[PDB]
Amino acid sequence: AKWVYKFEEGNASMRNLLGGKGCNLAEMTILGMPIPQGFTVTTEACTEYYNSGKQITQEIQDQIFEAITWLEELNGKKFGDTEDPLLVSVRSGARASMPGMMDTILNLGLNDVAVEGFAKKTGNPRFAYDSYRRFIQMYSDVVMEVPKSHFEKIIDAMKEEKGVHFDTDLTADDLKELAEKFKAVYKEAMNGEEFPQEPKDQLMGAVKAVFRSWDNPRAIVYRRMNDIPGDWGTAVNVQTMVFGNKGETSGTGVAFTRNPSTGEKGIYGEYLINAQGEDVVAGVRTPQPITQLENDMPDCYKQFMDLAMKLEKHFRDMQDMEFTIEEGKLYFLQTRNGKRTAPAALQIACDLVDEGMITEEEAVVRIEAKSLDQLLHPTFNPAALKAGEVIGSALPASPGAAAGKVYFTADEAKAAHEKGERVILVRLETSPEDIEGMHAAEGILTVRGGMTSHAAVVARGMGTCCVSGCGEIKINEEAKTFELGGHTFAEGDYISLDGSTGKIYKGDIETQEASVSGSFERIMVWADKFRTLKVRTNADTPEDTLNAVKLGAEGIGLCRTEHMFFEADRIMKIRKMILSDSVEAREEALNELIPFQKGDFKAMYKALEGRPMTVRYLDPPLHEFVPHTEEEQAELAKNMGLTLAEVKAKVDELHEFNPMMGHRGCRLAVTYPEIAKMQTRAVMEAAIEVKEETGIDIVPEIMIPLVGEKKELKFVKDVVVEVAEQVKKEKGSDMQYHIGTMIEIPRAALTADAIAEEAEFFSFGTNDLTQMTFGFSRDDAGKFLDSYYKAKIYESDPFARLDQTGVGQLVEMAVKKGRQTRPGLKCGICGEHGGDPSSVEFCHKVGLNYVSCSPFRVPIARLAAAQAALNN
């Protein structure tokens, strides 16, 4: 059946068939707009391809060519024809937006003859070859593997030798020449083979390699970053060209109907006099401000002006738009919802709602939950900024205060950042090839490329400062240095940028905390209103507490209690207990902890103010609390009066093949019910008084880690209660208090109906359940983990994102089961997953009471709650 569609034959509501591109392309057409005519091979073909074993069925290929013919007819020219040839572009696009990640080829169907036809038919040879070097360039770079630098340097070395600065300055001589060299590049790079002369070769060649784009390395990166199933595929758009390389009254631009950094109303973008779209999107040549095209083409801009506010309305959201003017005749190639900063993200929403185009529901919904992390990135200290040593100033591509140490590629910057380093990456061009870098880096500095460049839209997206098109940079790539201002910067040296001023700095500038702005707060009342999951916070100190509470969090979900045991005033008391041979001896020494931890629990409860807290009883194994240093073993052995060969014997004894799975947690509490009881008293006595002290009521939750058998937790909770019951009788407190569990071990989940006979609550630590379920531990894992992403085996970080398909089955089962035995059972999530919005939604969906996250993630959790509800 139909593998090929015509723009007119389609609409925005046909996105899964033709992409966001051909579905807005079609849409733009059906809007009557000046959109160059073409067709789309649907994402079904892409699929057929991989199952046609990276090939095109005789059927799907005839439809392509059959459709091409159709374009000829309409245009009045034949494909890659000899004299008056039809010229096409071969564009990609997935179901979703992944700016500059996949590839596109331009001017497809110029052979060795047609360029002469072309030259003569347009009476413009400068133009013909520019478009032909451009074909061999793009085509060979993408269809084959021949990299840009080659073409980038050749097109370089030649303007040098020729003593020219701009592309617009090469003669048709140099371009025909360059044409020759570009095919030399090709014929070379591929042991003999010469550049495909038949457009039916060119055409099929592109379509295929654009399907292939789907799995570019960089594409697999953007997809993980944004939870995109690597299986969707991409459609290939075949669109009849419109040429901007045709002179002064011709040229190419891209724009956002509103600011994508600031959020501000009114056009934003760039344009490039006499140029094809690539140079601009592809961060290859630095273009000028859009105000130019306004000034020096007051008409084509007024037209563009209208059509932009059309599309804004038609789509009811701020749009990024690709366009070309060919000889004073403006053309719209693309439109989409611009990827923006979170600060921007929010401003627009409030705006559109305020104006009246979108509701308060549509707002909360569209916002990319994760970008909220940006809103708490530290900004510069004014005085420090005002004293930093300016060395230069380029484009404010992406906002942010980025102080770091320079690397000249991505893989390195990433590694430097994955060491502990704060990295600033420095690059010739603004590229989506460097996405591994841009993400790693605190900041990005480039010599060329504009804010409209792909990378930029995407950098504004992730939350990476950018400063682009700094043509005053020299990059010394053998030396691994670069020159700007007066100096030369060595790899590792501190530069600092400001994606807001644009001004660049030698050195490393101070950063203070950041302010949370208005619209943020407006947005925050809506989610808060539409959501039904409560947002907790993983937090172990009153201070961590105040921070989350300030952001707008409702309780502590996980409050870990291992630091109460670690600290100088602490670590002795516990160390004593471990070396105690008598049980009373162990009791006795832990006891000397009680005034300490109770004073902790009071400091917390004070900060807490009646919000719930799930306190986490002692997690890890004793050997985490013993001295592995002989210095502190001998000291210890005197502190009590033993031979160092007993304390050394104890550790040795407590030591473990696998720490992840020792006599730890609930298995510990069992053999040493004493620690259980001790923490019971502190919590209770701290709770009771701080209620008696503040008047605000408290209902302690007590959480037991690493359970997996009902009878196990049974034994343990029986202890706690007694202690809670006595502390009560003593004090004479009627105080409600809950005892529940961590569901972190599968069997705990698998038997959730047994466990629930005991657990008053369930707390899901998928951090730990994901280790157990997967079989790898967080740490040692990294060893394969990246080799996995690049290979498409895990399309998400199981420790960063709750693996619903597997780990998730357990999460649900433990709910469906736990609640069957106890229907009014509360459940929470508290991992790192507790703040990933995929995890957050899913948790709203399998029936959670709450999610808990890091203080500074509470708002990702709150908006991610807002949307989990509305979307169901």
Ligand X SMILES: Nc1ncnc2c1ncn2[C@@H]1O[C@H](COP(=O)(O)OP(=O)(O)NP(=O)(O)O)[C@@H](O)[C@H]1O
**Shortest Cβ 794–a second copy spacing (Å):** 7
Q: Which of 859, 836, 847 is nearest to 814 (CA)?
A: 847
Helix or strand (DSSP H, E) at 265: strand 265-273
Q: Is 768 annotated as a binding residue?
A: yes
The set of residues, in sequence order, having a beta carbon less than 8 Å from that of 302 and lying 6+ positions away, is none
Near ligand X in 298-357, by CB under 6 A:
322, 324, 333-334
Nearer to a second copy, 196 or 740 (CB): 740
Question: Would you count residue 215 as binding a second copy (CB under 8 A)?
Answer: no
Question: Would you count residue 274 as binding ligand X (CB under 6 A)?
Answer: no
**Shortest Cβ 89–ligand X spacing (Å):** 3
Q: Is 317 annotated as a binding residue?
A: no
Distance of alpha carbon 89 from alpha carbon 238, whole angstroms: 6
**Shortest Cβ 797–a second copy spacing (Å):** 13
Contact 473, 300 (CB under 8 A): no
Provide the H-helix boundaries in 732-774.
Answer: 746-750, 752-755, 766-774
How many chain residues interact with ligand X (CB under 6 A)?
A: 24
Q: Is 249 annotated as a binding residue?
A: no
Nearer to a second copy, 322 or 803 (CB): 803
The set of residues, in sequence order, having a beta carbon less than 8 Å from that of 807 and lying 6+ positions away, is 766, 769, 770, 773, 774, 798
Q: Is 91 annotated as a binding residue?
A: yes
Say which entry of ligand X, a second copy, none residue 104 contacts (CB below 5 to 8 A, set by partner kind).
ligand X
Q: Which of 552, 519, 226, 518 is nearest to 360 (CA)?
A: 519
The set of residues, in sequence order, having a beta carbon less than 8 Å from that of 658 and lying 6+ positions away, is none
Q: Is 766 annotated as a binding residue?
A: yes
**Shortest Cβ 783–a second copy spacing (Å):** 4
Near ligand X in 242-271, by CB under 6 A:
242
Selected from 663, 728, 731, 738, the binder of a second copy by CB under 8 A is 663
Q: Which of 492, 466, 127, 493 is nearest to 327 (CA)?
A: 127
Question: Would you count residue 721 as binding a second copy (CB under 8 A)?
Answer: no
Distance of alpha carbon 193 from alpha carbon 47, whole angstroms: 29
Near a second copy in 452-481, by CB under 8 A:
none
The set of residues, in sequence order, having a beta carbon less than 8 Å from that of 699 and lying 6+ positions away, is 612, 735, 736, 737, 738
Q: Which of 528, 491, 485, 557 is nearest to 832 (CA)?
A: 557
Question: Would you count residue 91 as binding ligand X (CB under 6 A)?
Answer: yes
Q: Which of 619, 622, 634 is nearest to 763 (CA)?
A: 619
Residue span binding ligand X (CB under 6 A) among the ranges 139-147, 235-243, 415-423, 704-712:
235-243
Residue span binding a second copy (CB under 8 A) among the ranges 301-309, 395-403, 440-448, 708-716:
708-716
How many chain residues interact with a second copy (CB under 8 A)?
A: 51
Residue span binding ligand X (CB under 6 A) among the ranges 180-188, 239-247, 533-541, 640-648:
239-247
Query: How is residue 526 written in tokens?
Result: 């809506």
The set of residues, in sequence order, having a beta carbon less than 8 Å from that of 719 and lying 6+ positions away, is 669, 673, 676, 677, 680
Contact 764, 829 (CB under 8 A): yes
Distance of alpha carbon 825 from alpha carbon 243, whole angstroms: 66
Say which entry of ligand X, a second copy, none residue 793 contacts (CB below 5 to 8 A, set by partner kind).
a second copy
CB burial of residue 153 (10 Å; 0-12, 13-18, 19+): exposed
| The one catalytic residue among 830, 833, 843, 853 | 830
Selected from 582, 736, 805, 872, the binder of a second copy by CB under 8 A is 805
Selected from 109, 196, 388, 708, the binder of a second copy by CB under 8 A is 708
Nearer to ligand X, 100 or 499 (CB): 100
Distance of alpha carbon 424 from alpha carbon 575, whole angstroms: 45
Q: What are phi and psi of 273, to 5 degrees?
A: -55, 120
Which residue is listed with tokens 């916002």?
Answer: 367
Near ligand X in 94-133, by CB under 6 A:
99-100, 102, 104, 106
| Residue 830 appears among annotated catalytic residues | yes
Coil vs helix vs strand at 762: strand
769: number of Cβ within 10 Å = 26
Q: Which of 838, 837, 839, 844 is nearest to 864 (CA)?
A: 837
The 10 Å CB-count burial string (b at 16+, else e) for 379-402 is bbeeebbeebeebbbbbbbbbbbb
**Shortest Cβ 771–a second copy spacing (Å):** 7
Contact 430, 446 (CB under 8 A): yes
**Shortest Cβ 663–a second copy spacing (Å):** 4
Residue span binding a second copy (CB under 8 A) among the ranges 300-308, 332-340, 350-358, 802-810:
802-810
**Shortest Cβ 358–a second copy spacing (Å):** 39
How do 78-79 and 85-86 pair as beta strands? parallel
Selected from 89, 245, 464, 481, the binder of ligand X by CB under 6 A is 89
Distance of alpha carbon 258 from alpha carbon 357, whole angstroms: 15
| The one catalytic residue among 454, 623, 833, 844 | 454
Distance of alpha carbon 148 from alpha carbon 85, whole angstroms: 27
Selected from 144, 670, 735, 800, the binder of a second copy by CB under 8 A is 670
Question: Would you count residue 667 as binding a second copy (CB under 8 A)?
Answer: yes
Distance of alpha carbon 755 from alpha carbon 513, whole angstroms: 44
Residue span binding ligand X (CB under 6 A) among the ranges 5-13, 89-97, 600-608, 634-642:
89-97
Question: Would you count residue 800 as binding a second copy (CB under 8 A)?
Answer: no
Question: Which amino acid is it at 737?
Answer: Y
Distance of alpha carbon 26 from alpha carbon 862, whole angstroms: 37
Near ligand X in 25-64, by CB under 6 A:
36
Say which entry of ligand X, a second copy, none residue 277 contacts (CB below 5 to 8 A, set by partner kind).
ligand X
Nearer to ligand X, 10 or 859 (CB): 10
Question: Would you count residue 751 as binding a second copy (CB under 8 A)?
Answer: yes
Binding mask 9-28 for ligand X (x = CB under 6 A): ------------x-------
Near a second copy in 765-784, by CB under 8 A:
768, 771-777, 779-781, 783-784
Q: Is 216 annotated as a binding residue?
A: no
Contact 45, 216 (CB under 8 A): no
| Residue 623 appears among annotated catalytic residues | no
Binding mask 621-660 for a second copy (x = CB under 8 A): -----------------------------------xxxxx
Binding mask 810-849 for a second copy (x = CB under 8 A): x---------------------------------------
Query: How is residue 657 written in tokens?
Result: 């093949």
**Shortest Cβ 406–a second copy spacing (Å):** 26
Distance of alpha carbon 605 from alpha carbon 691, whole angstroms: 8
Q: Is 744 annotated as a binding residue?
A: yes
Say which entry of a second copy, ligand X, none residue 641 contacts (CB below 5 to 8 A, set by partner kind).
none
Residue span binding ligand X (CB under 6 A) among the ranges 92-100, 356-364, 437-445, 762-770:
92-100
**Residues of the shown chain interacting with ligand X in the complex, contacts defined by CB under 6 A:** 21, 36, 89, 91, 93, 99-100, 102, 104, 106, 239-242, 276-278, 281-282, 322, 324, 333-334, 454
**Residues of the shown chain interacting with a second copy in the complex, contacts defined by CB under 8 A:** 656-663, 667-668, 670-671, 706, 708-709, 711-712, 714-715, 744-748, 750-751, 768, 771-777, 779-781, 783-784, 787-788, 791-794, 803, 805-807, 809-810
Per the annotation, binding residues for Mg(2+) are 744, 768
- Residues with a known catalytic role: 454, 830
Per the annotation, binding residues are 91, 560, 616, 744, 765-768
Per the annotation, binding residues for substrate are 560, 616, 744, 765-768
